Amino acid sequence: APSRNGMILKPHFHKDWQRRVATWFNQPARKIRRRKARQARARRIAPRPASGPLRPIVRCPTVRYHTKVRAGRGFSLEELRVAGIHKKVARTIGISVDPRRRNKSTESLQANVQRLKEYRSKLVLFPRKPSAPKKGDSSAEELKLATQLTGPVMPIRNVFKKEKARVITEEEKNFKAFASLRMARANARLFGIRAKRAKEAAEQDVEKKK
Template sequence: MHCFRTSFFLSAIFRPRREVGNHGTQPKWHAFEPPLPQRLADEGAHLVQPACKEDSQAKGPYHTKVRAGRGFTLEELKAAGIHKKTARTIGISVDSRRRNRSSESLQANVQRLKEYRSKLILFPRKASAPKKGDSTEEELKMATQLSGAVMPIKNVHKKEKARVISEDEKNFKAFASLRMARANARLFGIRAKRAKEAEAESIDKKK
């Protein structure tokens, strides 16, 4: 016969959980946290952030929605001609962990960085000794303080107009095209090897 015994070694750690269960109220330190996209937007409201799409596995219309990301990638900064250490000093958020998975998002964020850099007016630390990259005196006179989010991201929904389906679209077989593309990608190496061997054999026969 076995004896089952329950031990409570972490009694102090689970005290907040017991308070929730016993009194039906949450402890004082437990506060409501908004979802991640909203937190990122609130934290980086004073910084320029990249445009990122929602998770591709999201259901409904959410996978096409564009939101503010945590920071620009090092590849995007390099393409825009901005050093990663300089970016943090001029109001650009940087995320060294994020990776670019498509050339479209890379080009869009690079263009976003270039637009921000063209609108940015950089004051010199010493007015008597301006450095390379600082704004000129004429640009400093035109400077105005920005209030609110920096270059906010707006989702614009474009409706496509109804049109007549063409004959090419009617005859197009999507499933067969996808299978053919997968087969070509899978057999690319084998076909290249066979073509190389056949070329070598033809050269040997000529000799």
């Protein structure tokens, strides 16, 4: 029963929720178990990075964000081909590869290629056997650093480019942002109608001749 201006609410407690209440008293134990498993995996892969395979530079859909840069699922096949890295060899070297990614713009492709180049530049490849074969790095850069890399390997940081103060001209002063926006919206709305009217006018023009 309502009483003197209370908020109208509908609690969703009409089912047998007490039977399906999920407590969280195991949260610290779960965190400890995950930490122990992570440390065990890090000790398992002694020279390999703790975080794991390298992740590519990826932008976001859903124009809500439209600007944030995050880690991708894996490097695209075209990016690997441009960088000169075989897709199967990349998995064994520690490069995340997914075969579903597309490449529409050149900027992302070039950024990922540069990232792969930098990773191969700062990659130390241990030989299969103690006697170093071809493509194995020298023993000089093996004793100095045989430890893991904490955190993500080459972390992605969203960086913005600073713009210096300009000399704003009369044209930029006379630019009409609101009017341009309204005109563009109107043109987008009426583009099809204008085309239909043009088609009808052309039909009338060709009918006049006949």
